[PDB]
Amino acid sequence: SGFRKMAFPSGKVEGCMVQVTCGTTTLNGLWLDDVVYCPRHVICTSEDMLNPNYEDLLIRKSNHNFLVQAGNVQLRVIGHSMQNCVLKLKVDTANPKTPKYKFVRIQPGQTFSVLACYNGSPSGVYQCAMRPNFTIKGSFLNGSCGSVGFNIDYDCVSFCYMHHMELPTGVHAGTDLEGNFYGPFVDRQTAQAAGTDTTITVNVLAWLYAAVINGDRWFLNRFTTTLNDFNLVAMKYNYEPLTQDHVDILGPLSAQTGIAVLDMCASLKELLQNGMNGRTILGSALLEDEFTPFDVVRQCSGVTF
Amino acid sequence: SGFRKMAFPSGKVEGCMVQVTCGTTTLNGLWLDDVVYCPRHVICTSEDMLNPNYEDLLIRKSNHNFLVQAGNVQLRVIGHSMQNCVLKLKVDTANPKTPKYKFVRIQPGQTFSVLACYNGSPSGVYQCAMRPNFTIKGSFLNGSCGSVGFNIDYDCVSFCYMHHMELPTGVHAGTDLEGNFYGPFVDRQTAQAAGTDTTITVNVLAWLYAAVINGDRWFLNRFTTTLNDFNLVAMKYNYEPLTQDHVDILGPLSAQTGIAVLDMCASLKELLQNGMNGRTILGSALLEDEFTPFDVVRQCSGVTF
Ligand SMILES: *[C@](O)(C(N)=O)[C@H](C[C@@H]1CCNC1=O)NC(=O)[C@@H]1[C@@H]2[C@H](CN1C(=O)[C@@H](NC(=O)NC(C)(C)C)C(C)(C)C)C2(C)C
Numbered sequence: 216s217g218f219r220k221m222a223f224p225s226g227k228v229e230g231c232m233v234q235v236t237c238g239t240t241t242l243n244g245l246w247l248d249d250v251v252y253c254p255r256h257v258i259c260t261s262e263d264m265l266n267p268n269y270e271d272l273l274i275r276k277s278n279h280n281f282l283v284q285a286g287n288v289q290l291r292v293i294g295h296s297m298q299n300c301v302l303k304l305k306v307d308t309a310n311p312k313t314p315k316y317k318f319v320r321i322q323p324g325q326t327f328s329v330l331a332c333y334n335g336s337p338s339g340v341y342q343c344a345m346r347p348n349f350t351i352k353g354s355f356l357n358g359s360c361g362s363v364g365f366n367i368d369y370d371c372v373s374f375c376y377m378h379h380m381e382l383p384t385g386v387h388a389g390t391d392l393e394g395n396f397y398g399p400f401v402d403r404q405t406a407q408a409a410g411t412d413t414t415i416t417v418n419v420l421a422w423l424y425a426a427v428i429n430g431d432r433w434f435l436n437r438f439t440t441t442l443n444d445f446n447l448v449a450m451k452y453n454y455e456p457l458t459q460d461h462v463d464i465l466g467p468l469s470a471q472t473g474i475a476v477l478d479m480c481a482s483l484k485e486l487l488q489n490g491m492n493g494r495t496i497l498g499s500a501l502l503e504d505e506f507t508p509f510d511v512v513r514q515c516s517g518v519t520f
Numbered sequence: 521s522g523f524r525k526m527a528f529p530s531g532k533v534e535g536c537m538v539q540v541t542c543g544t545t546t547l548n549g550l551w552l553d554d555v556v557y558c559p560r561h562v563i564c565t566s567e568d569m570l571n572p573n574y575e576d577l578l579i580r581k582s583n584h585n586f587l588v589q590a591g592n593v594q595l596r597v598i599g600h601s602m603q604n605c606v607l608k609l610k611v612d613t614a615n616p617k618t619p620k621y622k623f624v625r626i627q628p629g630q631t632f633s634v635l636a637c638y639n640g641s642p643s644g645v646y647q648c649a650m651r652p653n654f655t656i657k658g659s660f661l662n663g664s665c666g667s668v669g670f671n672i673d674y675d676c677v678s679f680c681y682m683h684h685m686e687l688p689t690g691v692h693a694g695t696d697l698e699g700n701f702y703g704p705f706v707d708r709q710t711a712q713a714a715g716t717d718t719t720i721t722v723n724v725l726a727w728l729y730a731a732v733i734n735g736d737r738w739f740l741n742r743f744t745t746t747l748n749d750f751n752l753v754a755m756k757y758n759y760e761p762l763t764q765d766h767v768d769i770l771g772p773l774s775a776q777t778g779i780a781v782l783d784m785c786a787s788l789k790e791l792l793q794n795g796m797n798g799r800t801i802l803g804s805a806l807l808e809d810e811f812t813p814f815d816v817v818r819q820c821s822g823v824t825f
């Protein structure tokens with residue numbers, strides 16, 4: 216039936232996007248009820264960003280200094296506060312298009328959709344994974360700050376990410392909706408190093424189950440392995456260790472295909488040691504780790520929202 | 521800044537999705553103003569689909585036989601007609617969430633976003649390209665029929681595709697919003713062969729410009745070539761011929777990067793003859809042809825809708 220990197224329908228999130236302007240800085244904001252959430256560096260000038268004192272710059276700002284716009288319509292700011300690296304601008308009007316929502320902090324290895332926005336207007340939507348080094352491989356230009364990452368559960372929008380900065384080699388970093396950065400990053404234009412990234416093993420295994428479901432079965436060998444032996448091989452190839460919790464999460468795909476997780480582990484062990492010999496799996500020449508076991512089932516067994 | 525397969529924000533299209541039921545068949549419909557558009561095989565039973573007479577089966581159907589639902593809310597059907605392979609069900613209520621729209625027939629090689637739906641509910645959004653053989657590499661299960669492909673131009677939704685069937689190796693076929701199939705396909709469960717696919721050359725060249733913009737420049741050689749010589753090489757590798765119209769369409773990227781189209785053609789000619797030696801371009805190990813020159817500029821120079 217086909218397998219694509221599918222993003223969540225962005226509608227519920229689009230109705231929340233606002234444009235936040237302070238002084239000469241404009242970025243995106245998330246308007247849920249009577250509160251607007253945006254990165255705190257909206258109160259910075261290009262020079263402050265080199266080493267800023269956010270608490271100090273916010274003292275010198277009053278409510279009227281924040282120009283918040285939902286399309287053409289300006290929202291009056293009646294309060295402002297700082298929660299970590301995020302600004303909460305209270306507005307005189309509650310967002311009527313606010314969906315049922317939660318603020319979650321995703322774990323590394325989990326996926327989400329990013330609705331990239333410029334001037335409070337959505338330009339596109341794509342699926343991302345929180346890398347083990349706490350970064351994301353996104354597509355963001357100047358003005359994309361404030362764009363959010365999310366997941367949908369029938370009617371509930373679970374917001375997990377807000378864009379803040381770009382790192383070397385097109386890697387991106389940001390915070391949860393409580394202003395807490397994911398990883399060892401700070402909102403300052405100073406040298407900051409991202410840790411070594413690893414391949415999300417449980418996601419590669421889920422992608423191998425998606426391939427069998429879809430008819431691509433060539434890589435399947437006639438062997439099994441132990442959780443210990445597999446982890447010895449994977450360690451060399453910069454793959455994160457597979458835990459028994461990862462084995463249980465993979466249960467549904469294993470039961471659906473009839474392939475025990477440890478037999479799929481033996482097939483993956485062979486693809487790491489022998490290579491793919493110029494062959495593809497689900498049209499891909501590289502092993503993919505940006506599809507969780509849930510993304511696989513939701514896609515290959517039509518979960519709607 | 522990063523480069524991802526980005527889809528258009530699905531919001532404007534989500535507000536148009538309905539569930540269409542006739543007898544025991546349920547699929548998706550597009551509700552624009554007081555009309556619902558859906559595949560005509562909604563009036564078929566599993567046995568009719570083997571060799572159906574749509575004109576005959578539609579005679580035996582009256583308005584009340586179509587159960588149309590927008591969420592919980594049932595829409596009363598006050599008229600029905602057939603335009604090619606599509607059904608137009610007139611309803612007593614105009615869709616208040618209808619956006620400014622057009623119905624276009626895209627040319628092969630062009631891209632669009634697919635909002636995959638089940639029971640009139642959106643499950644996800646992804647970017648597709650109309651293959652030169654008039655098929656799409658989508659992700660559709662049973663119940664996905666009626667899901668639509670589209671493009672957005674600031675506020676205008678240009679609907680170009682409606683899902684009808686699946687072809688061998690996870691390839692998909694459908695119609696424009698006037699019920700005309702793309703390619704030599706008919707809505708019947710009989711053996712039908714899809715032509716040989718080719719690689720969209722102008723899209724690969726646009727993707728090579730996206731890579732230079734993003735800093736991946738290793739594949740750039742110190743040579744130029746003629747339009748004729750390049751097309752001789754490309755022909756062997758199953759690449760469509762590059763026309764002078766394709767050269768002019770690539771102008772903006774060429775002017776932005778300072779790389780003449782024929783110099784980029786020489787670099788591509790070398791990648792076809794010598795291979796990539798295990799290297800990647802924009803994180804990809806294979807040459808990508810599902811990004812038009814417009815997708816490149818819109819992404820690398822933030823066009824919002
Ligand atoms: C954001 O402020 C906006 N308005 O879009 C912007 C988004 C960036 C710009 C290019 N692509 C993006 O994703 N973010 C910033 O300008 C933040 C901001 C100031 C510096 N900054 C950066 O992202 C810089 N990166 C950086 O310093 N990276 C280190 C060295 C820390 C790993 C830079 C060089 C402008 C991309 C602060 C407060 C961090």
Ligand SMILES: *[C@](O)(C(N)=O)[C@H](C[C@@H]1CCNC1=O)NC(=O)[C@@H]1[C@@H]2[C@H](CN1C(=O)[C@@H](NC(=O)NC(C)(C)C)C(C)(C)C)C2(C)C
Pocket residue numbers: 216546547561569660661662663664665684685686687688692706707708709710711712713
């Ligand atoms: C659609 O009717 C729905 N309700 O979703 C369904 C969508 C299919 C089912 C699996 N994945 C999809 O995208 N489409 C159909 O069932 C259409 C319909 C009947 C047969 N059909 C097919 O897609 C079949 N394919 C087929 O016959 N392919 C040929 C041999 C013509 C190239 C099949 C085998 C059910 C997938 C009609 C009227 C064409």
